[PDB]
Amino acid sequence: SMACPLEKALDVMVSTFHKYSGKEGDKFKLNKSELKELLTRELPSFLGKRTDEAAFQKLMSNLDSNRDNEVDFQEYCVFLSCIAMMCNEFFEGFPDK
Amino acid sequence: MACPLEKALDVMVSTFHKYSGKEGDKFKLNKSELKELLTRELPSFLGKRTDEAAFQKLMSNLDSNRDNEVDFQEYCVFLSCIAMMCNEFFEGFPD
Ligand SMILES: [Ca+2]
Ligand SMILES: [Ca+2]
Ligand SMILES: [Ca+2]
Ligand SMILES: [Ca+2]
Numbered sequence A: 001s002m003a004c005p006l007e008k009a010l011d012v013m014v015s016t017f018h019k020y021s022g023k024e025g026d027k028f029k030l031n032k033s034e035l036k037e038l039l040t041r042e043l044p045s046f047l048g049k050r051t052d053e054a055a056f057q058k059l060m061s062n063l064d065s066n067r068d069n070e071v072d073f074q075e076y077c078v079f080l081s082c083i084a085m086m087c088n089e090f091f092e093g094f095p096d097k
Numbered sequence B: 001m002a003c004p005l006e007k008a009l010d011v012m013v014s015t016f017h018k019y020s021g022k023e024g025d026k027f028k029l030n031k032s033e034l035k036e037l038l039t040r041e042l043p044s045f046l047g048k049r050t051d052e053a054a055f056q057k058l059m060s061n062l063d064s065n066r067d068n069e070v071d072f073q074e075y076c077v078f079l080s081c082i083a084m085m086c087n088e089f090f091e092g093f094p095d
Helices: A005-020 A032-042 A054-063 A073-091 B002-021 B033-041 B052-060 B074-092
Strands: none
Touching: A005 A032, A005 A073, A005 B074, A032 A054, A032 B002, A032 B074, A054 A073, A054 B052, A073 B074, B002 B074
């Protein structure tokens, strides 16, 4: 847990996904309803107030690459990687350098 | 010039037309003009990522009206989305 923080990160990546994907419908994929709870309860700093729905449909449409109205674990990792790639750039001072 | 927030509004309008008037519609960006604007005007936004498949995804994620182009409205939405994100790390997102 503490002796390997990078391992604990991969745990909460798989567990947080299934924390909501199994609430309704396909137990292995996130619908628009489950994508809303996961981002709200687990990534609160990312959203802010938000709740524009249309932008949520845009976010749901951008993540859903295969166009099946769901977010599988593949697209779930791409979205997290895109956020981490930004956290890396702003660590290097993107808007100020 | 004298006011920085004013020049910020001026550069966003001029930078858009700095590339939109090159090919086709004079007021809408195509995929080539969008790539010139991102690489030349926002280099640190994309760390020299050359993935054409991923660049097309950003092109479709911005083309909200599905006209294969990026007008000024979608140009402002994308810039505000970036600015809103800069704000989160300023305040302290994973930190
Ligand atoms: Ca589900
Ligand atoms: Ca999907
Ligand atoms: Ca054009
Ligand atoms: Ca458009």
